[PDB]
């Protein structure tokens, strides 16, 4: 497909535009943002000081 | 009138063959028929409308 990228926006295609093909879409939901970050990841290891349970 | 011919039978050769063909021309001209037969080369795709279009420059 001929296009003009200078506009800052480019028309999206599938193999269907230039060749004899068919679209091959299949649904999935793991690419939603909320789903993607809704899992735990670590930020580091921490410690407690001696006898902090009963002092300043 | 007519000449010197006095045969009963229909002329065996038809007229366009037995005689010349008197034609008449009109003063103001005459339009050629549109087509002389059906032989032709063709130009296709000459124009537009339809493609992977309007991504195409203005």
UniProtKB/Swiss-Prot annotation, chain A:
Intracellular or extracellular location(s): Virion; Host cytoplasm
Function: Forms an icosahedral capsid of pseudo T=3 symmetry with capsid proteins VP2 and VP3. Together they form an icosahedral capsid composed of 60 copies of each VP1, VP2, and VP3, with a diameter of approximately 300 Angstroms. VP4 lies on the inner surface of the protein shell formed by VP1, VP2 and VP3. All the three latter proteins contain a beta-sheet structure called beta-barrel jelly roll. VP1 is situated at the 12 fivefold axes, whereas VP2 and VP3 are located at the quasi-sixfold axes.
The protein's name: Capsid protein VP1
Organism: Mengo encephalomyocarditis virus
